[PDB]
Amino acid sequence: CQDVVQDVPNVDVQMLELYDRMSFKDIDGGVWKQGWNIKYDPLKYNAHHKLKVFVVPHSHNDPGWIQTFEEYYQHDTKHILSNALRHLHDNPEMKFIWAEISYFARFYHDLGENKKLQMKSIVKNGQLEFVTGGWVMPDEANSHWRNVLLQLTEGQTWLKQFMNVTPTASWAIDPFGHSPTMPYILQKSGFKNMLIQRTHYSVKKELAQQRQLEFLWRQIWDNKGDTALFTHMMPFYSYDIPHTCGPDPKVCCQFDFKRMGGLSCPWKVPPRTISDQNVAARSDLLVDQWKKKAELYRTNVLLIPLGDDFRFKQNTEWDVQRVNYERLFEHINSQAHFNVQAQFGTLQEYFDAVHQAERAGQAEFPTLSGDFFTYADRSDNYWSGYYTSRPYHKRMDRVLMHYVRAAEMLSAWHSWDGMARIEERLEQARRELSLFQHHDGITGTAKTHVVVDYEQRMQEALKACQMVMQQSVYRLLTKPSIYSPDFSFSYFTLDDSRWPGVEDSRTTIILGEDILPSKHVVMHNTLPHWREQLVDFYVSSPFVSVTDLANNPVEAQVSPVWSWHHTIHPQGSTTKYRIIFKARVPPMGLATYVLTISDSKPEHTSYASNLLLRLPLGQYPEDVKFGDPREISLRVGNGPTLAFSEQGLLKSIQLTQDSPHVPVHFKFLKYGVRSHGDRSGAYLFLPNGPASPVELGQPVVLVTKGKLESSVSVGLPSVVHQTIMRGGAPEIRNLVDIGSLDNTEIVMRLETHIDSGDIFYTDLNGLQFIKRRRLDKLPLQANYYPIPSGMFIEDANTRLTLLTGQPLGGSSLASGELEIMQDRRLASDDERGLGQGVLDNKPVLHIYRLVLEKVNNCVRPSELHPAGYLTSAAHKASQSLLDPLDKFIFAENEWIGAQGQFGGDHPSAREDLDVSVMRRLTKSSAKTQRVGYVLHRTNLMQCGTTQKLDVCHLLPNVARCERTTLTFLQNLEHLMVAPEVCPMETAAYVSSHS
């Protein structure tokens, strides 16, 4: 295994290093607005050194944006793929690439058998080529790496199953900036090449000047270069035809033959039909554009994309584009003075030719590490808005992520009879979650009615996972001699304290000495180690005692159920109470407990005090005390001591008894919208200067203090803010309701004396932490980065890490600060084609963990390393947000067969290892059962403080085991023990069973 801490990779282009060197001047470059006037020596080309030109037709098909998936399918995409099948069948030289497998599966299953076989023939002979072959073209900012792999797996599994092809070239022309998570996953899924488009106009210019637009993209920690993937960055403003033929859109627009009589060229020179009278002049004009594009690249092989949004819809667009281009190719190829060979081609054809040129010593490509965030398409129009837009659905993504993992893991342990409809359910759940990874899904850049479609699809997916999970738990914990399932029955309902939070959903367990004395509850632990976590349930009485199934008592706390009402004041229930206790759950296992009512206070249940600083609670045995606003200090267990202001906001953290009171102030601020010039929208973050504090007024502060759990809650305007303490890093919950505050972005900022300087760290796709440097030379919105799972600041002694349960936008705009946007309400459109602002806000419960740590005894990476690494504590805290324990309440009065535990024999793997995916790959009807596992090992900082896990042997009667691509679709290594994986490596294994 490489050291990913002490050794700094040597690369030609390191994006943090490049960003520091670059001036980012927005100078007018001429016809190429953001570059220069390209010049080539025409004696470069001759009969032995020709320019080889691949014109690759394509159609950008969004699975939701202005219209829903189904609306676009019926209006546009079904016509595009019908015409593709017809025109490619009829015209053997015509080529076409397709990215979005969600639309292609939708289309293909509706074809007659004859059309299906015609479709198969144009894929077999390389006319129609799948590029990436993901379910969608995913967002690369907000997306979790697990969901990127999920949607890739769903598309390529469909392609291999129904078309017997697996793409090895990726096409990502529309995501709003680009993550190195994509090559990481692609290169471990058999990919050889990838293409990207939406990078900062100054980055395009800088790299274009050095012909570094093609590069071997490696991970920021990768010293060896084993992660390296060949990347082609397109050089210009757009993927449309005006911006793909060459540097002058005025000329290129004339070679988009659909723009003749209801689309036109904004540069006012129309395309003209190619005739014997003009082909000589047109060819000269076009080949001059191509030869300028070729100056930006190191080989004599040129990629010329030919397409746009929902193109190749009408049969006559196929005609007009194919016939004009063929007349040009025929003229150009026959005329030796050009020294061009031009033809229709595919993306793979381009990359194959480029690598032939490389092997022949004709070019040697530079190495690159880093990311391509934050994207600007022009001037100061940075796309940091969508890091936060529609934060409700951003949170929902992380919840559905966890439920699909839990549902697939729990149901994997057994084969299911097809009458159970497990496969049906999991396929729906995976596809709705896969669809939401679209760059108009999780981004929050779709119209209101499309966001509603995504929400309803994810809601059906959640319900599907719940049904699989409850059926699975009943089977795993009911004695096999008794187990006799009704596959339509709800044996358990799920209890979730964190989603929606917002809604009054959660069921109250009703107990009574006569009516129903006791209730079985079950906790699931998807992580492959022993875990202890406080769980809570709503109960009808405060006189409840907790036992395991062996009747061993378990220490418990009962709190009141509080709600907030609109000044903003708390109200308490007189009919339901929270019972709180510590569940100990095996690795990838289940634990059963029992809640029992009594006359009065049981031996092993404590009651929390309540202090209203500025109310009956039924049979709650401790009355609510009252008082004037004042500072408070709270400690739970031997964990930290937290001090709060008189407004209920954290002011300091003391880690241990004999350590300092470290200042850490939470503060809410607001950003506004520019009155004159560019308006913030779903995409763009264009603040009118620094954020200004939110007037907190005189807010009610609720203090609950218990043996197991305490909290400080306050009703601020727009936000119920809560700090929860359970004996380690506290948990922050914001109930965010931006209500009517038009042209407002609400931000949450932390202020420390940490000596961070201009340095902060933010994660990419919850996989890796990347070093950011604040740049005063760039506007505020450019120092905003994705916060998909966490951010931190540190000096020589102290680190502060904020972990998120949801992707949001954030920065460190000054030494010792962190900030993260909560929500944004925007009256204006930002002129990127969405044609509306963001006025559909709804209450969302944001969740966080706050880890203050001393790092002076931690082995930090080189001051030159572009990566940072979490501590054990911060990593485990991210794990508690993203993959908490699942809670099951038994639906019926009695549970015969009930067992106490599943997975007590499962190995407890080292803390840095995760079984990201467990998925049974085969239905019951298959002779050999097969189960897929994705193993991810992170890298944790060593600070001076477990069994071997072999997934091949987790299920019994293993006949075979291999290392696979992460999609499980190809074997890389026949083994039957899975070897343990390196820090920052992800490996897949498929075990076969007799």
Ligand X SMILES: OC[C@@H]1NCCC[C@H]1O
Binding residue (CB under 5 A) for Zn ion from 14, 62, 367, 749: 62
Query: Looking at this protein, which amino acid is placed at residue 384?
Result: S
User: What is the Cα–Cα distance from 429 to 404, expressed in whole angstroms?
Assistant: 7
Helix (H) or strand (E) holding 288: helix 279-295
Do β-strands 169-172 and 128-130 pair in parallel, antiparallel, or remain unpaired?
Answer: unpaired
| Min separation Cβ 458 and ligand X, Å | 19
Residues between 817 and 836 that touch ligand X (CB under 6 A) = 832-833
Helix (H, G, I), strand (E, B) or coil at 454: helix
Pick between residue 310 and residue 607 the one whose CB is nearest to Zn ion.
310
User: What is the Cα–Cα distance from 124 to 130, expressed in whole angstroms?
Assistant: 11
**Which of 3, 20, 139, 174 does the annotation list as catalytic?**
174
Query: Which does residue 214 touch among Zn ion, ligand X, none (CB within 5 to 8 A, set by kind)?
Result: none
Q: Which one, of 693, 713, 711, lies nearest residue 701 by Cα?
A: 713
Pick between residue 174 and residue 737 the one whose CB is nearest to Zn ion.
174
Query: Which does residue 833 touch among ligand X, Zn ion, none (CB within 5 to 8 A, set by kind)?
Result: ligand X
Pick between residue 155 and residue 715 the one whose CB is nearest to Zn ion.
155
The region, left, alpha or beta by phi > 0 then psi within -120 to 50, assigned to residue 194 is: beta
| Min separation Cβ 832 and ligand X, Å | 5
User: What is the DSSP annotation of 731-744?
Assistant: EEEEEE--TT-TTE
Q: Record the tokens describing residue 951, joined without a space.
A: 């997934």
Q: Is there a binding annotation on residue 486?
A: no
445 binds ligand X (CB under 6 A): yes
74-82, 438-446, 487-495, 925-933 -> range binding ligand X (CB under 6 A): 438-446
Q: What are the DSSP E strand ranges found in 542-568?
A: 544-548, 553-554, 556-565
Residues between 162 and 201 that touch Zn ion (CB under 5 A) = 174
Query: Which does residue 445 touch among ligand X, Zn ion, none (CB within 5 to 8 A, set by kind)?
Result: ligand X
Residues between 30 and 69 that touch ligand X (CB under 6 A) = 62, 65
CB-CB contact of 920 with 411 (8 Å): yes
Q: List, in order, residues 6 or more apart from 724 with CB less than 8 Å away.
A: 709, 710, 711, 730, 731, 732, 733
255 binds ligand X (CB under 6 A): no
CB-CB contact of 138 with 438 (8 Å): yes
Q: Is there a binding annotation on residue 174?
A: yes
The pair phi, psi for residue 77, each rounded to 5°, is: -70, -35
CB-CB contact of 949 with 913 (8 Å): yes
| CA distance between the termini of the chain | 34
Long-range contact list for 771-775, CB < 8 A, 24+ apart? Answer: 771/16, 771/865, 771/866, 771/867, 771/868, 772/16, 772/811, 772/812, 773/16, 773/19, 773/20, 774/811, 774/812, 774/813, 774/814, 775/19, 775/20
84-92, 439-447, 465-473, 663-671 -> range binding ligand X (CB under 6 A): 439-447
User: What is the Cα–Cα distance from 77 to 70, expressed in whole angstroms?
Assistant: 9
Helix (H, G, I), strand (E, B) or coil at 876: helix
DSSP label of 32: S
Count other C-beta atoms under 10 Å from residue 770's C-beta. Answer: 23
User: What is the Cα–Cα distance from 735 to 718, expressed in whole angstroms?
Assistant: 8
Pick between residue 174 and residue 962 the one whose CB is nearest to ligand X.
174
Could you give the dihedral angle defined by the CA atoms of residues 64, 311, 142 and 208, in that order, rounded to the nearest 10 degrees?
-170
Interaction pattern, residues 115-154, with ligand X; x per rule: CB under 6 A: ----------------------------------------
| Min separation Cβ 60 and Zn ion, Å | 6
377 binds Zn ion (CB under 5 A): no
User: What is the Cα–Cα distance from 34 to 377, expressed in whole angstroms?
Assistant: 10
174 binds ligand X (CB under 6 A): yes
Do β-strands 544-548 and 553-554 pair in parallel, antiparallel, or remain unpaired?
Answer: antiparallel
Pick between residue 377 and residue 536 the one whose CB is nearest to Zn ion.
377
Query: Which does residue 817 touch among ligand X, Zn ion, none (CB within 5 to 8 A, set by kind)?
Result: none
240 binds Zn ion (CB under 5 A): no
439 binds ligand X (CB under 6 A): yes
The strand order across the sheet containing 701-705 reads: 625-627, 609-613, 701-705, 710-716, 719-725, 731-736, 844-854, 798-804, 790-794, 759-764, 768-773, 867-868
Tell me the number of residues near ligand X by CB under 6 A.
8
Q: What angle do CA 540, 541, 543 make, to 5 degrees?
A: 150
| Min separation Cβ 57 and ligand X, Å | 19
| Min separation Cβ 440 and Zn ion, Å | 6
Binding residue (CB under 6 A) for ligand X from 76, 139, 248, 440: 440
| Min separation Cβ 64 and Zn ion, Å | 10
Longest dimension (CA), the chain: 101
| Min separation Cβ 62 and ligand X, Å | 4
Q: Is there a binding annotation on residue 62?
A: yes
Pick between residue 832 and residue 860 the one whose CB is nearest to ligand X.
832
State yes or no: is 256 an active-site residue. no
Helix (H) or strand (E) holding 724: strand 719-725
With b for 16 or more beta-carbon neighbours within 10 A and e for fewer, the 745-768 pattern comes to bbbbbbbbebebeebbbbbbbbbb
85-93, 358-366, 437-445, 889-897 -> range binding ligand X (CB under 6 A): 437-445
Query: Which does residue 731 touch among ligand X, Zn ion, none (CB within 5 to 8 A, set by kind)?
Result: none
| Min separation Cβ 824 and ligand X, Å | 16
| Min separation Cβ 691 and ligand X, Å | 26
Q: Which one, of 991, 989, 993, 992, lies nearest residue 933 by Cα?
A: 989
| Min separation Cβ 174 and ligand X, Å | 5
Pick between residue 141 and residue 634 the one whose CB is nearest to Zn ion.
141
Using Cβ positions, the residue closest to Zn ion within the complex turns out to be 174
The strand order across the sheet containing 193-196 reads: 13-14, 367-369, 214-217, 229-233, 193-196, 169-172
Pick between residue 174 and residue 962 the one whose CB is nearest to Zn ion.
174
| Min separation Cβ 445 and ligand X, Å | 5
Query: Which does residue 745 touch among ligand X, Zn ion, none (CB within 5 to 8 A, set by kind)?
Result: none
Q: Is there a binding annotation on residue 60?
A: yes
Pick between residue 99 and residue 736 the one whose CB is nearest to ligand X.
99
Sign of CA dihedral 234, 238, 241, 246: negative
Q: How far is CA 211 from the centre of its chain?
A: 31
Residue ranges binding ligand X (CB under 6 A): 62, 65, 174, 439-440, 445, 832-833
What residues are labeled active site? 174
Residue ranges binding Zn ion (CB under 5 A): 62, 174
Binding residues for Zn(2+) are 60, 62, 174, 439
